[PDB]
Amino acid sequence: VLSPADKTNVKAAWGKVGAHAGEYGAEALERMFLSFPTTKTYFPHFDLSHGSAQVKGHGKKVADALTNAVAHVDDMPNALSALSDLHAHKLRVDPVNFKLLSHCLLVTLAAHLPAEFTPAVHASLDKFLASVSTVLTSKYR
Amino acid sequence: VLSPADKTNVKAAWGKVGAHAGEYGAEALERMFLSFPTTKTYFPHFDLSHGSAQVKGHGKKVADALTNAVAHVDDMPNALSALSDLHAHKLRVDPVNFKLLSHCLLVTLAAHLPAEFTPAVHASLDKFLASVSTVLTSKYR
Amino acid sequence: VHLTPEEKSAVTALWGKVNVDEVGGEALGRLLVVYPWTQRFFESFGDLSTPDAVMGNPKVKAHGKKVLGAFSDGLAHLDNLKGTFATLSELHCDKLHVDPENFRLLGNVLVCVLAHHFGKEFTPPVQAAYQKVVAGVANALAHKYH
Amino acid sequence: VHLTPEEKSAVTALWGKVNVDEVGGEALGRLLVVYPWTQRFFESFGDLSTPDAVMGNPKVKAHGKKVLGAFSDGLAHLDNLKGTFATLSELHCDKLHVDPENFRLLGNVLVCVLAHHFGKEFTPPVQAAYQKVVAGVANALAHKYH
Ligand code: HEM
Ligand code: HEM
Ligand code: HEM
Numbered sequence: 001v002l003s004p005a006d007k008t009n010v011k012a013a014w015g016k017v018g019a020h021a022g023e024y025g026a027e028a029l030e031r032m033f034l035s036f037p038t039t040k041t042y043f044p045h046f047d048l049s050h051g052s053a054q055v056k057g058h059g060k061k062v063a064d065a066l067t068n069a070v071a072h073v074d075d076m077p078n079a080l081s082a083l084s085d086l087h088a089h090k091l092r093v094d095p096v097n098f099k100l101l102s103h104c105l106l107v108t109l110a111a112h113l114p115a116e117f118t119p120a121v122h123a124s125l126d127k128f129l130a131s132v133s134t135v136l137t138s139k140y141r
Numbered sequence: 142v143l144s145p146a147d148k149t150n151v152k153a154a155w156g157k158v159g160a161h162a163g164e165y166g167a168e169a170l171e172r173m174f175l176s177f178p179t180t181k182t183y184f185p186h187f188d189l190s191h192g193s194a195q196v197k198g199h200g201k202k203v204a205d206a207l208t209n210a211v212a213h214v215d216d217m218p219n220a221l222s223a224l225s226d227l228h229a230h231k232l233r234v235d236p237v238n239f240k241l242l243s244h245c246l247l248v249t250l251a252a253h254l255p256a257e258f259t260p261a262v263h264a265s266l267d268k269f270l271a272s273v274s275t276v277l278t279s280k281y282r
Numbered sequence: 283v284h285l286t287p288e289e290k291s292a293v294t295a296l297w298g299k300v301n302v303d304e305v306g307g308e309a310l311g312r313l314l315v316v317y318p319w320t321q322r323f324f325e326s327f328g329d330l331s332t333p334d335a336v337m338g339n340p341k342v343k344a345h346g347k348k349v350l351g352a353f354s355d356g357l358a359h360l361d362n363l364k365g366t367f368a369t370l371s372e373l374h375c376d377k378l379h380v381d382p383e384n385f386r387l388l389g390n391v392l393v394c395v396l397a398h399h400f401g402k403e404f405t406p407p408v409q410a411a412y413q414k415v416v417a418g419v420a421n422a423l424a425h426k427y428h
Numbered sequence: 429v430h431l432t433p434e435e436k437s438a439v440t441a442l443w444g445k446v447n448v449d450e451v452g453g454e455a456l457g458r459l460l461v462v463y464p465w466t467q468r469f470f471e472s473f474g475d476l477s478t479p480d481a482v483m484g485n486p487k488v489k490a491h492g493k494k495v496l497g498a499f500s501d502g503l504a505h506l507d508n509l510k511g512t513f514a515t516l517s518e519l520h521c522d523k524l525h526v527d528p529e530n531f532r533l534l535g536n537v538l539v540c541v542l543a544h545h546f547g548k549e550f551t552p553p554v555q556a557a558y559q560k561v562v563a564g565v566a567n568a569l570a571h572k573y574h
C-alpha cells in the first residue's frame with residue numbers, strides 16, 4: 001500500500017523527470033534488453049539496435065503511462081484499466097518480466113537524479129513500481 | 142480474482158480433505174524442505190527428521206489456517222489479518238518462499254485426491270493459494 | 283544434473299511407468315488452463331476457450347506428446363542436457379520466441395501431473411529428484427538464448 | 429561467470445574507482461530500508477525503525493564495509509567464484525541461516541548504488557556486465573546450502 005509518504009516521494013521524484021520522461025523510458029528499455037536478454041522475446045518485431053526509433057518511441061509510451069499512474073496514484077486500477085486488459089488479453093507478458101523492467105527504471109532514475117534518489121525515495125519508487133506491475137497483472141486469470 | 146467458480150472448486154476440494162488436512166499440511170512441509178533446501182533456513186530451531194512431531198505440529202497449524210481461509214473465502218484479508226501481521230513483523234519470510242510451499246501444497250493434494258484434482262480445480266486451487274500468499278505478505282512494507 | 287544414483291534410479295524407475303503421449307497431452311493442457319497467458323503461442327491450435335476445449339483439443343494433445351517425447355530423450359542424457367537440447371534451445375529462441383519462464387512453468391505442472399498419476403508412489407524424496415530434473419531441462423532449453 | 433574480455437575490463441575499471449567503505453555502507457543500508465524484512469538477521473545492530481536511523485547506524489556501515497570487502501576480493505577470482513566463496517557459503521547456511529534470496533536482493537541494491545554514484549559512467553553495457561557478476565556472486569554464495 002502506497003502510504004501518504006510514498007505518494008509524496010513518488011510525486012517528487014517523477015516531478016523531477018519532466019521532459020526527460022520519454023528518454024528515461026527509452027534508457028530503461030535498452031538496459032533491460034541488454035541485462036536480461038530473455039525480455040527480447042516479446043519484441044521480435046522491433047529493431048533493438050542502439051537508438052532504434054521503435055525503442056525510443058516505445059520508451060515514451062511507457063513513460064507517459066507511468067506519469068498517468070503518478071497523477072492517479074490514488075485510483076491506479078481505474079487509470080490503468082485499458083492497459084490491464086491489453087497485457088492480460090493480447091500481450092500476455094509473463095509476470096516475472098515486470099520485475100525486470102521495474103529494476104531498470106530504478107537504475108535509470110538513480111543514474112539521472114542523484115540528489116533525489118535518497119534511500120527513502122528509493123524505497124517509495126520500488127513500492128510504486130510494484131503496485132503498477134500488480135495492476136497490469138491483475139487480470140491475467 | 143477468485144470467481145464464483147473458483148470458490149465452488151476450492152470449497153469442493155477442501156471439503157474432501159476433511160480431517161486429513163493436518164496430515165497433508167505436514168506432508169507439504171516435508172516435500173518443500175526436500176525439494177527446496179533453502180526453505181529450511183526459517184526452521185533452524187525445528188527437528189526436521191521424517192515424522193518430526195514439530196513438523197507434524199506445524200503442518201496442522203498451516204492446515205488449520207487454510208481451512209479458516211476457505212471458511213471465509215469472502216473476507217480473507219480480515220480472516221487472516223493476524224497471520225499477516227505475524228509474517229510481516231516477526232517471521233519476515235521472503236515472499237518467494239510462499240510460492241514454493243504453495244507448489245508443494247498442490248503436489249500433496251494432487252497425490253491424495255486424483256478424482257477431484259481436475260484441470261479446472263487445479264487452476265482454482267493455484268489461484269486460491271496465490272491469493273492467500275498475497276494476503277500474508279501484504280503488510281511487509 | 284547432479285543426481286545421486288538413488289535419485290537417478292528413482293527417476294528412471296518411475297519414468298519407465300509413464301505413458302508419454304498421455305502424460306504429454308496432460309501436462310501441456312493443464313499449463314494452458316492454469317496459466318492462460320501461455321496460450322499466446324498457440325493461436326493456430328484453435329479453440330482454447332474452456333478447460334474441456336483445451337484438454338480435448340487434438341492439436342494440444344498432439345503437441346504435448348511431441349514435447350514430452352523430446353523431454354524423455356533428455357532423460358537418457360542427464361550428464362549432457364545442454365548438448366542434448368542445444369538445437370531446440372536455438373529454435374525456441376530465434377524462431378519461436380518462447381520466454382524461458384515457460385519451461386519452468388511446464389516443469390512444475392508436469393510434477394503435479396506425475397503426482398496425480400502415481401499417488402503415494404510419488405514420495406517426497408522422488409519429487410525432490412524430479413524437481414532437479416525439470417530445473418535442469420529448463421536451464422538447458424534456455425542456454426542458447428541471446 | 430564468463431565475461432567477455434571487454435566486459436571484464438569494464439567491470440574492473442569501474443571497481444578501481446569504488447570507495448568500498450562508503451558503497452558497502454550505502455548498499456547494506458538501502459537493503460534494510462527498501463526491503464524491511466531483511467532486518468530479521470540484524471536486530472542487535474540497534475534501532476532500524478527509520479531510514480535515517482538505518483543509514484546512520486554505525487554497526488550497519490561497519491557490516492557493509494565487511495560484506496563489500498568480501499565481494500571486492502571475489503572480483504579477482506572471477507574464474508572460480510565457487511571455490512572462492514565455498515567456506516562463506518557454508519557459514520551463511522549452517523551458522524547464520526541466511527536465505528540465499530537475500531544475496532539476489534543485495535546484488536540488485538548494489539547495482540542501484542553504483543548507478544547512483546557513477547551516473548553517466550554506468551552505461552547499459554557496463555550494467556549488463558555487473559548484473560552477471562552479482563548473479564555469479566549470489567550463485568556462488570548459495571552453492572553449499574543443503
Ligand atoms: C512498468 C510496466 C509497464 C508499463 C507501464 C507498460 C506500458 C505499456 C504501454 C502504454 C504500451 C503501449 C500500448 C499502446 O500501443 O497503446 C505497452 C505495450 C507493450 N508492452 Fe507493456 N508496459 C509495461 C511492462 C511491460 C513488460 C515488462 C514487457 C515485457 C518485457 C512489456 C511488453 C509490452 C509489449 C510487447 C508491448 C507491445 C509493443 C508493440 O507492439 O508496440 N510491457 N506497454
Ligand atoms: C501460505 C502458507 C502459509 C500459511 C497458511 C502459514 C501459516 C502459518 C501459521 C498458522 C503459523 C503459526 C502461527 C503461530 O502460532 O506462531 C505460521 C508460522 C510460521 N511460518 Fe508461516 N505460513 C505460510 C507460509 C510460510 C512459509 C512459506 C514459510 C517459510 C518457508 C513460513 C514460515 C513460518 C515460520 C518459521 C513460522 C513459525 C514456526 C514456529 O516457530 O512454530 N510460513 N505460519
Ligand atoms: C519441456 C520443454 C519443452 C520441450 C522438450 C519442447 C519440445 C518441442 C519440440 C520438439 C518442438 C518441435 C520442433 C520443430 O517444430 O522443429 C517444439 C515446438 C514448439 N514449442 Fe516447445 N518444447 C518445450 C516446451 C515448450 C513450452 C512450455 C512452450 C510454450 C508454452 C513451447 C512452445 C512451442 C511452440 C510454439 C512450438 C511450435 C509449435 C508449432 O506451431 O508447430 N514449447 N517444442
Ligand code: HEM
Nearest residue numbers: 466469470494495498499516524526530531534565566569
Ligand atoms: C552477497 C554478499 C554477501 C557476502 C559476500 C557476505 C559476506 C559476509 C562476510 C564476510 C561476513 C563476515 C563473517 C565473519 O566475520 O565471520 C558476513 C557476515 C554476515 N552476513 Fe553475509 N554476506 C553477504 C550478504 C549478506 C546478506 C544479504 C545478509 C542478510 C540480509 C547477510 C547477513 C550476514 C550476517 C548476519 C552476518 C553477520 C554475522 C555476525 O554478526 O557474526 N550477509 N557476511
